Design an enzyme around this catalytic site. Structure first.
Site, PDB file in Angstrom:
ATOM      1  N   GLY A   1      11.180   1.556   4.861  1.00 28.01           N
ATOM      2  CA  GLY A   1      11.458   1.009   3.554  1.00 28.01           C
ATOM      3  C   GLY A   1      12.437   1.821   2.738  1.00 28.01           C
ATOM      4  O   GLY A   1      13.083   2.745   3.236  1.00 28.01           O
ATOM      5  N   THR A   2      12.542   1.470   1.465  1.00 27.97           N
ATOM      6  CA  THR A   2      13.512   2.075   0.579  1.00 27.97           C
ATOM      7  C   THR A   2      13.210   3.550   0.366  1.00 27.97           C
ATOM      8  O   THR A   2      12.158   4.066   0.744  1.00 27.97           O
ATOM      9  CB  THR A   2      13.521   1.367  -0.772  1.00 27.97           C
ATOM     10  OG1 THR A   2      12.223   1.455  -1.367  1.00 27.97           O
ATOM     11  CG2 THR A   2      13.908  -0.078  -0.619  1.00 27.97           C
ATOM     12  N   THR A   3      14.159   4.218  -0.270  1.00 31.99           N
ATOM     13  CA  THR A   3      14.080   5.630  -0.597  1.00 31.99           C
ATOM     14  C   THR A   3      13.695   5.811  -2.057  1.00 31.99           C
ATOM     15  O   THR A   3      13.971   4.958  -2.901  1.00 31.99           O
ATOM     16  CB  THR A   3      15.422   6.300  -0.329  1.00 31.99           C
ATOM     17  OG1 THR A   3      15.818   6.042   1.021  1.00 31.99           O
ATOM     18  CG2 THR A   3      15.341   7.776  -0.543  1.00 31.99           C
TER      19      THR A   3
ATOM     20  N   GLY B   1      10.896   7.151   2.172  1.00 32.87           N
ATOM     21  CA  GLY B   1      11.871   6.225   2.700  1.00 32.87           C
ATOM     22  C   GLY B   1      12.435   6.643   4.043  1.00 32.87           C
ATOM     23  O   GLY B   1      11.850   7.413   4.809  1.00 32.87           O
TER      24      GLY B   1
END
Lengths: 242, 134, 238, 244, 246, 234, 250, 249, 135
Positions: E32-34, E164
């Site tokens: 997923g995102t950071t 992330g």
């Protein structure tokens, strides 16, 4: 399995639902039975599978089973499940008579006890009623005879005669031959010699095994005496002379 | 070879196959093999050898007892009352070492004492309180 | 089942699951120890630190649940706190109801008896932890108790725990057969500390700071951690 | 949860149209002990052949193949006694309820259709086993006089004359199927029992410790029946009067 | 727990004492995102890579941050909605605290709640763990804090944080930065020091562009409350950090 | 190929991290039909075509009222829409008798995103398998949002979903800085927001009944242009 | 929450023997040894603990436990599934019998209700049985001294002199020979004591063992003297030197 | 994979590995396995029709009921199974009277089926947030029909999947497709009640497994005048009587 | 053995112009054994035998003993019943078991009881099920 919809819920790819057709596939292993409505009378019959002359003759738990003066019930197959339907029907009789100030019909009754089974097969944590039954008797102050057959899938379908359980297909073909929507039997004894005669193919002339009532207008309910039966069992056999 | 003998009695020689040949057969465990074979076809009587009765076992103890010795002081049936339904086949066993036990001490003459012994020789050594049931 | 759930045994006459729960306690390669006194106890737990972004005041395996009581965990943390929390919440009951504070023994007669209940009704898995306690009671003196995933709670003269509770003890029971005392002397809450640290480093042989170790002492109406500059006082020996 | 807690095998059918747990349970009893019950004209009896007969096992204080319900009805239990002390605790109240609202004692046809209807109750509802049990009954009334019944773990009860249960029974009936008259005084009934039990069991020695039975009568004219369980000495009386 | 095994369902200790139904999750958040969490010497600051997955998205329209009652900033990572769930529990329970004890909420006892609600989704059989790795950091009379969150509940107290797909990349700088500043930076300057991360972390994913958002909380700048930052501040930053990385 | 487990329920992660059942839900709506829209600074639109069974039959209803300051469409299962809709009317009704400072659009997404979460972790239940489109209006002006069963609500200019959709969104990406600069001209963005729907389909006759639109703005209450009044907008 | 009312143990295998029961008591036999016997005038029970490590105290862990001043029990099986049910058991004797009447219960039916603790667990949903087959000893006035075994099903038997556990069979094979129909106590404890010592290696220290009895009242312990209708507690265990001086006799 | 269905059928509320969930479609088949029905749109009235499966010559076939009224001006037919259909009737007609109490007017028909087709989604999820009531779905394709003000003579086609379409004519049973073809090229827009009643029988003489009469089909009508009723046998034995000359050649 | 099948499976159908032949076979159990060789191109149909009906059974046995004494007339019609699912062929056994029972006589004399003693006997070996649920 509180809930869990085990396999009663799981429809088939053919469409059927396994545990239901399984049920009345199990029902045929039990004692047969039969019903007839003639001109003015209605008649029923069952059997007792052969015991060792120990099966207590006096207070046997039988197949006919009253509800009121004007309604009865016969059944087939399982027995422990039979005893509750007989209870939570006549419950509603004493209730229906009360809160409506007048007794039951029969088209009110078969709807209930045919609708109950559907709840015992469209709910969770429940097994169906592995049983098939029929209803018999008049409405109040009416000459008309009625019997309704019902089975665990929940459908009720009226009849003029019908048989349930073991070797019925060995039997009902005899009745469609003799019985006809043309013209009833005249009166009581006519139906019976016709009724009994149809059994004889699965009977080994055990007159003790078979047990009978009738139903009449004004709720003149009665069960009949083995002598009165047995003296039909023989003269009908006296007619065999050919 | 079972498939053939079953037919070897039927439909090719069956008009005369089991004519005058009159077989028998001796087994254990009739309830595992085919039902094809035991039937009235090819067989008549699924007869049965149970264990003996108390009166039976006396005879069968008296008969392998023949050639032993000029014995005396015996009532050779009460042993059967010492001994439940075991077989009418093993009792030669207890009939055997009774001699051996005396042979072990060279008295060719025998006694009831040894039958009391040898009977207990076999099953007391061939022998769980979880009676959850009533 | 028979090898996945708990509430059905093996065919053998035991089970397999809970025997694993003992095993995850060693899933942090930590060691600990605890001892006694006339008025004092000690507990210690070596502290590891990977990547240095942590706040080592926040890191702690220790939870002084109440006055008079103290505990430290083994195994992992998150399945420990819930075992610590209802403990803390329970002392708001025994006191409010039975007048006064809980001794340890009633607690480790209790905090285990429900862990048993977590292995009859299997809806809650058993807590992945073995767990200890400390205190200075009033009848029986400074008492220690151990606890576990299934509850053979036991009092102690001392303890040992980690992946290496076989030899750290052997560095300890060596002389409680010699000194002929379950008790230990040098009652004041300092001198007994070096005893705990000198015998373990004798079993390990590794040097430390205030950074990497800790302290916990059971004392009358007291329990607390503190500053561990007294690493030095071992130095005077050799 | 459902995919791995096998709550499905209970309360369902075969494709050939039958039940497993019940045909298993009905078989499961036959590992257990044995009992009988008959119906003499004068009175009623029972009996029970234990198997637990370790010598130091106390077997003389009270009993386990036999119980009571009230002052006029008795039974002969078979099964596992962890699944007997409950419904009995639900039976004994029932008399002490039936009287409590109708000031009379039970028409005995009614309660077995109150005990059976909890045994049935589990083998339709839930995912629970049934009570692995089979019972005898023995009782007296006025609208039917004497009686005798027999039950099952499913809930199918039956009235019967002279019955055995448990082990090795299908011959036991066939061992007496000739011997049952209908006159049947009492003291020509017990001779049948020992003549029954002493031809079916492990050891014909048959220590009294390996045996229990009871009796019912009408000893006060125009009076109730005498519940009497027999105790060791008076058990032993008829045990040796027969000469064995 | 390779097949005919134990990883599939929760609350079954694999024989090395593990819930392999859990450690599948931390790969999810890793997919997923950071996002990050930093301890100013007087408070906190956060960040995140908002992810243009298309052109039709609007700046400053669909945030990736929620917030506690007044102060406690909270971020998300991995899966958003499961994150969004317990943040509804975040604002919930802290009011039960406030109404009762008549004050705002301290952060250590806060995790004492939120570090159990998720733990109490690990131990049953008929539930799933929160597939996230949350961060929340705030301020109080005892100073400021920062707390990272793992689904099994292994929350500790950090001074710098990351998550992330860019962790070992990013957190390296956070270590390679702080050693050069044992002082502990004030607020405005750590901002651009952190935006340096994201425009460096995205190096993985050069198929696309992106954007970001910023948090802000300190004593000298908000009275220790949470908010975002707009105008020339962060605009002076994004070009700055973008300027000093070429 | 070969079977996978881990799909049997909506509770097991994959070995990677997927909730493999969830994607099979989202499968249906690309397997399902299309319902799209776009945004103006003063107006915003829904549009979706229809299906049928035979010619004797009418068409499916696909766009549903929820209040004047909000409405939505769907693409997927029919039941789950009514669940949300019969749910969604209540909150925009609930705010209108308790605060009467009318419900905004964005927080509606932020609470029904949390609907699906609750129904995607427990056992006993099932995920609402729809990706729907929605519009609104407020003090902040008009908006346009998207739904997935994940809970991923996203605020946007325009969007397409359903089968054969890619070219139409692709048309929209190619045609972006034009349709939105307008204000007070609703009947011309739709003229671009129809040929948008002329991307990939057959439609070899008068698509008069196969198609339906609603719209709102700073003045326009939510009303569904349906029937031959739509025919001009072709 | 807890969606597993699915009845475990309710699946009769086709032979008719239950599944976990015959597995559960597979433990108790794998467990340690114990015993308890009977006399005309007194009763005794005893076992040994196996500390398994030296430093652990071996006087807090009371394997024997009280449940009334006139009844006492022991087990040999699993430990932690014992100390939970006594707390139910002794609670019952206050509730089901005492508060409603006033007296303490006989032991013809305490065991019955303790059994009902057990069968309600082997029959509900997702509950294992308690891995113990304990035994109780008590005193009454319709029956006086008495003894009872139980089992994790619920079937309680009475007994006269019994062991259960590791080598119980060897002990049951032992007692009955040198047992006597009127072996009164101070020889009973002896034969009882040695009845264990054969079943053990390691050490037979006086501190190693616990035991206790039910004999005659001892109102030196009753404390609240000044009431003739307050008899003495008939139950009382023993310390670790008055056992260790019957022990020097052998 | 190898088994897409059998490895995911037992999960009642489980979507397929390709999107379209299962036990609904297993529930959407058995409607064919029962017995057909049919109904037609018309402005001067509406017609419905079925067979009845005269199994044996003992069943008094006036007693079977694949057809029943909801109210004075609404009638419903059935198919497939029938034990599972009473419950919707016993819930359906309840709404009409209730609508004729809380609102006191006569109820629409489009405002009816929405409160019928929602009812068959209580399994798995629920309609208005409520949890569940019943294990499994239940398969009866129904055919409501009824006059109203806003729209007049209508019918719908229920379905346990929760869908329903305002057909102008639609069949059921395994013979549906075998006839629904035949209606598509026959249904005009300006027909009469009678010729439709003459039309429908063309199919039953066509589709059925055996030669039909009074006691193999029955019918039911609609009027804004009378509302809803049925046709007795001799009436059925007259529309069939003068049927034939239209097929004399 | 597979090669023993093929050529015959071939020789069967490889032969066309069966103006005269009828190549037929039979067995006692097929539903788990035989291949999916079945094709009307190879094999057409398959016809069943199984246990009889009562009136079917009624045709069976006086015709046997038609070649036999019947010293006395013993109303066999009530002898048997449909409930006892006899073989079709325990009955020539029945017919001779009784003369065997007169082989347990000096009398060569026919009696109903002999049949009574036989079916009681032979079915002592035949199976019997539990009427547990009274199903």
């Amino acid at each position: 399995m509180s809930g869990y919809d085990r396999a009663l819920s799981i429809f088939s790819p053919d469409g059927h639902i396994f545990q239901v057709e399984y049920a009345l596939e199990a029902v045929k292993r039990g004692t047969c039975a039969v019903g007839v409505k003639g001109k003015n009378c209605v008649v029923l019959g069952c059997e007792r599978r052969s015991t060792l002359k120990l099966q207590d003759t006096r207070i046997t738990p039988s197949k006919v089973s009253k509800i009121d003066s004007h309604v009865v019930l016969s059944f087939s197959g399982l027995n422990a499940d039979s005893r509750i339907l007989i209870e939570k029907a006549r419950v509603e009789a004493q209730s229906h008579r009360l809160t409506l100030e007048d007794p039951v019909t029969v088209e009110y009754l078969t709807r209930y006890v045919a609708g109950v089974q559907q709840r015992y097969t469209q709910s969770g944590g429940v097994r169906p009623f592995g049983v098939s039954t029929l209803i018999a008797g008049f409405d109040p102050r009416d000459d008309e005879p009625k019997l309704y057959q019902t089975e665990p899938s929940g459908i009720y379908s009226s009849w003029s005669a019908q048989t349930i359980g073991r070797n019925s297909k060995t039997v009902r073909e005899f009745l469609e031959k003799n019985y006809d929507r043309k013209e009833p039997p005249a009166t009581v004894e006519e139906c019976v010699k016709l009724t009994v005669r149809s059994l004889l193919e699965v009977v080994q002339t055990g007159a003790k095994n078979i047990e009978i009532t009738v139903v009449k207008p004004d709720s003149d309910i009665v069960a009949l005496s083995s002598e009165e039966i047995n003296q039909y069992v023989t003269q009908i056999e006296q007619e065999k002379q050919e | 070879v079972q498939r053939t003998m079953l037919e070897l009695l039927n439909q090719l020689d069956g008009f005369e196959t089991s004519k005058n040949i009159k077989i028998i057969m001796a087994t254990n465990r009739l309830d595992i093999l085919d039902p094809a074979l035991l039937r009235p076809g090819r067989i008549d009587r699924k007869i049965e050898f149970p264990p003996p009765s108390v009166a039976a076992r006396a005879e069968i103890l008296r008969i392998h007892s023949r050639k032993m010795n000029l014995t005396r002081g015996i009532n050779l049936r009460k042993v059967a009352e010492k001994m439940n339904g075991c077989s009418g086949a093993d009792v030669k066993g207890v009939c055997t070492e009774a001699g051996m036990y005396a042979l072990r001490e060279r008295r060719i003459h025998v006694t009831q004492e040894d039958f009391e012994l040898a009977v207990g020789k076999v099953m007391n050594k061939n022998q769980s309180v979880a009676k959850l049931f009533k | 089942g028979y090898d996945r759930h708990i509430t059905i045994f093996s065919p053998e006459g035991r089970l397999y699951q809970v025997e694993y729960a003992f095993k995850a306690t060693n899933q942090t390669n930590i060691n600990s120890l605890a001892v006694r006194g006339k008025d004092c106890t000690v507990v210690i737990s070596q502290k590891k630190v990977p990547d240095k972004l942590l706040d080592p005041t926040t890191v702690s395996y220790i939870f002084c649940i109440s006055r008079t009581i103290g505990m430290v965990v083994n195994g992992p943390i998150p399945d420990a706190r819930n075992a610590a929390l209802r403990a803390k919440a329970e002392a708001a009951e025994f006191r409010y109801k039975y007048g006064y504070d809980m001794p340890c023994d009633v607690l480790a007669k209790r905090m285990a008896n429900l862990s048993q209940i977590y292995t009859q009704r299997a809806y809650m898995r058993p807590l992945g932890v073995i767990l200890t306690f400390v205190s200075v009671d009033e009848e029986l003196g400074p008492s220690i108790y151990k606890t576990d995933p299934a509850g053979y709670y036991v009092g102690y003269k001392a303890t040992a725990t980690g992946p290496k509770q076989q030899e750290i003890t052997t560095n300890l029971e060596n002389h409680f057969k010699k000194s002929k005392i379950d008790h230990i002397n040098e009652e004041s809450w300092e001198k007994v500390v070096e005893f705990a640290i000198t015998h373990m480093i004798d079993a390990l042989g590794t040097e430390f700071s205030k950074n990497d170790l800790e302290v916990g002492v059971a004392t009358k109406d007291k329990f607390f951690t503190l500053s561990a500059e007294n690493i030095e006082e071992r130095l005077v020996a050799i | 949860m459902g995919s791995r807690r096998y709550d499905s095998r209970t309360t369902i059918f075969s494709p050939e149209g039958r039940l497993y747990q019940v045909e298993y349970a009905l078989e499961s009893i036959s590992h257990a002990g044995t009992a009988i019950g008959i119906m003499a004209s004068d009175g009623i009896v029972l009996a029970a052949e234990r198997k637990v007969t370790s010598t130091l096992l106390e077997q003389d204080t009270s009993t386990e193949k036999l119980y009571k319900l009230n002052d006029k009805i008795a039974v002969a239990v078979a099964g596992l006694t962890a699944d007997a002390e409950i419904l009995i605790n639900t039976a004994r109240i029932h008399a002490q309820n039936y009287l409590k609202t109708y000031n009379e004692d039970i028409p005995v046809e009614i309660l077995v259709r109150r005990l059976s209807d909890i045994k049935q109750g589990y083998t339709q509802h839930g995912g629970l086993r049934p009570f692995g049990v089979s019972f005898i009954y023995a009782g007296y009334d006025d609208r039917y006089g004497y009686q005798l019944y027999t039950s099952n773990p499913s809930g199918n009860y039956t009235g019967w004359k002279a019955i055995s249960v448990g082990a090795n029974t299908s011959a036991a009936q066939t061992l007496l199927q000739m011997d049952y008259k209908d006159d049947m005084k009492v003291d020509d009934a017990i001779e049948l029992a020992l003549k029954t039990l002493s031809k079916t069991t492990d050891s014909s020695a048959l220590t009294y410790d390996r045996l229990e039975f009871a009796t019912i009568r009408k000893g006060a004219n125009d009076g109730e029946v005498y519940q009497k369980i027999f105790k060791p000495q008076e058990i032993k009386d008829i045990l040796v009067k027969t000469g064995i | 727990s390779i097949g005919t095994g134990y990883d599939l369902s929760n609350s079954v200790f694999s024989p090395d004492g593990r819930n392999f139904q859990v450690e599948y999750a931390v790969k999810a958040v890793e997919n997923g995102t950071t996002s990050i969490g930093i301890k100013c010497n007087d408070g906190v600051v956060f960040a995140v890579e908002k992810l243009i997955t298309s052109k039709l998205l609007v700046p400053q329209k669909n945030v990736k941050i929620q917030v506690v009652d007044r102060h406690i900033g909270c971020v998300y990572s991995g899966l958003i909605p499961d994150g969004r769930h317990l943040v509804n529990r975040g604002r919930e329970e802290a009011a039960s605290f406030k109404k009762l004890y008549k004050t705002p909420i301290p952060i250590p006892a806060f995790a004492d709640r939120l570090g159990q609600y998720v733990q109490a989704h690990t131990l049953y059989n008929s539930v799933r763990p929160f597939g996230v790795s949350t961060i929340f950091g705030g301020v109080d009379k005892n100073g400021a804090h920062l707390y990272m969150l793992e689904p099994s509940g292994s929350y500790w107290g950090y001074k710098g944080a990351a998550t992330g797909k860019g962790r070992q990349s990013a957190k390296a700088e956070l270590e390679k930065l702080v050693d050069h500043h044992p002082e502990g930076l004030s607020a405005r300057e750590a901002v651009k020091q952190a935006a340096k991360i994201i425009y460096l972390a995205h190096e993985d994913n050069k198929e696309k562009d992106f954007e970001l958002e910023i948090s802000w909380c300190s004593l000298s700048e908000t009275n220790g409350l949470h908010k975002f930052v707009k105008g020339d501040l962060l605009q002076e930053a994004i070009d700055f950090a973008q300027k000093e990385i070429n | 190929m070969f079977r996978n487990n881990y799909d049997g329920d909506t509770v097991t992660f994959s070995p990677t991290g997927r909730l493999f059942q969830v994607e099979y839900a989202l499968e249906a709506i690309k397997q399902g039909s299309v319902t799209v829209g776009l945004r103006s600074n003063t107006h915003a639109v829904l549009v979706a075509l229809k299906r049928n069974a035979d010619e004797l039959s009418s068409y499916q209803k696909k766009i549903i009222k929820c209040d004047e300051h909000m409405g939505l469409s769907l693409a997927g299962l029919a039941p789950d829409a009514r669940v949300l809709s019969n749910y969604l009317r209540q909150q925009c009704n609930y705010s209108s008798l308790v605060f009467n400072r009318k419900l905004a659009v964005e927080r509606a997404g932020h609470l029904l995103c949390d609907k699906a979460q609750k129904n995607t972790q427990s056992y006993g239940g099932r995920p609402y398998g729809v990706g729907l489109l929605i519009i609104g209006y407020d003090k902040s002006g008009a908006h346009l949002l998207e739904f997935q069963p994940s809970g991923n609500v996203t605020e946007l200019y325009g969007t397409a979903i359903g089968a054969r959709s890619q070219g139409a969104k692709t048309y929209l990406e190619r045609t972006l800085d034009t349709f939105i600069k307008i204000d007070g001209n609703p009947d011309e963005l739709i003229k671009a927001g129809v040929e948008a729907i002329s991307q990939s389909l057959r439609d070899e006759s008068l698509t008069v009944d196969n198609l339906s639109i609603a719209i709102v703005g700073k003045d326009t209450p939510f009303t569904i242009y349906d029937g031959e009044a739509v025919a001009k907008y072709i | 929450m807890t969606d597993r009312y699915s009845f475990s143990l309710t699946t009769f295998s086709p032979s008719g023997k239950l599944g976990q029961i015959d597995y559960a008591l597979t433990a108790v036999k794998q467990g340690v040894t114990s015993l308890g016997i009977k006399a005309t005038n007194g009763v005794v029970i005893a076992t040994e603990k196996k500390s398994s490590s030296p430093l652990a105290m071996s006087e807090t862990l009371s394997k024997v436990s009280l449940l009334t001043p006139d009844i006492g029990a022991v087990y040999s099986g699993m430990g932690p599934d014992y100390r939970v049910l006594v707390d139910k058991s002794r609670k019952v004797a206050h509730t089901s019998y005492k508060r409603i009447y006033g007296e303490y219960p006989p032991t013809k039916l305490l065991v019955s209700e303790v059994a009902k603790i057990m069968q309600e667990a082997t029959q509900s949903g997702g509950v294992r049985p308690f891995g113990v087959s304990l035994l109780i000893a008590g005193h009454d006035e319709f029956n006086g001294f008495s003894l009872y075994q139980v089992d994790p099903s619920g079937s309680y038997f009475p007994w006269k002199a019994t062991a259960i556990g590791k080598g119980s069979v060897a002990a049951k094979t032992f007692l009955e020979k040198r047992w006597n129909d009127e072996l009164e106590l101070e020889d009973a404890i002896h034969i009882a004591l040695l009845t264990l010592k054969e079943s053990v290696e390691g050490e037979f220290n006086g501190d190693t063992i616990e035991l206790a009895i039910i004999g005659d009242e001892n109102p030196d312990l009753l404390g609240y003297t000044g009431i003739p209708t307050d008899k003495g507690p008939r139950f009382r265990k023993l310390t670790s030197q008055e056992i260790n001086d019957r022990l020097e006799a052998l | 994979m190898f088994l897409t269905r059998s490895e995911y059928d037992r999960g009642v509320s489980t979507f397929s590995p390709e999107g379209r969930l299962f036990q609904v479609e297993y529930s959407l088949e058995a409607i064919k396995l029962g017995s057909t029905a049919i109904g037609i749109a018309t402005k001067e009235g509406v017609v419905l029709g079925v067979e009845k499966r005269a199994t044996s010559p003992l069943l008094e076939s006036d007693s079977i009921e694949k057809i029943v009224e909801i109210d004075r001006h609404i009638g419903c037919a059935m198919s497939g199974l029938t034990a599972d259909a009473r419950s919707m009737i016993e819930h359906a007609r309840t709404a009409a009277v209730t609508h004729n109490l809380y609102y006191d007017e006569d109820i629409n028909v489009e405002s009816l089926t929405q409160s019928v087709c929602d009812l068959a989604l209580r399994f798995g999820e629920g309609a208005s947030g409520e949890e569940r009531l019943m294990s499994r779905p239940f398969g009866v394709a129904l055919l409501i029909a009824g006059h109203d003000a806003d729209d007049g003579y209508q019918l719908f086609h229920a379905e346990p999947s929760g869908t329903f379409y305002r057909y102008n004519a639609k069949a059921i049973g395994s013979g549906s497709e075998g006839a629904q073809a035949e209606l598509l090229n026959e249904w005009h827009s300006s027909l009469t009640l009678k010729e439709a009643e003459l039309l429908v029988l063309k199919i039953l003489k066509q589709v059925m497994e055996e030669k039909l009469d009074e006691n193999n089909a029955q019918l039911s009508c609609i009027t804004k005048q009378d509302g809803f009723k049925i046709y007795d046998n001799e009436k059925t034995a007259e529309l069939i009587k003068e049927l034939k000359e239209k097929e004399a050649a | 053995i597979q090669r023993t099948m093929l050529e015959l499976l071939n020789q069967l159908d490889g032969f066309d112009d069966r103006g005269d032949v009828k190549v037929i076979m039979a067995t006692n159990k097929i539903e788990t054994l035989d291949p999916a060789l079945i094709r009307p191109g190879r094999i057409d149909r398959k016809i069943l035998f199984e246990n009889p009906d009562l009136s079917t059974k009624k045709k069976i046995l006086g015709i046997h003993t038609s070649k036999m004494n019947l010293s006395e007339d013993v109303n066999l019609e009530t002898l048997v019943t449909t409930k006892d699912d006899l073989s079709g062929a325990d009955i020539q056994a029945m017919c001779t078991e009784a003369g065997l029972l007169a082989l347990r006589e000096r009398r060569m004399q026919v009696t109903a009881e002999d049949f009574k003693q036989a079916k009681e006997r032979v079915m002592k070996n035949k199976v019997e099920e539990n009427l547990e649920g009274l199903y």
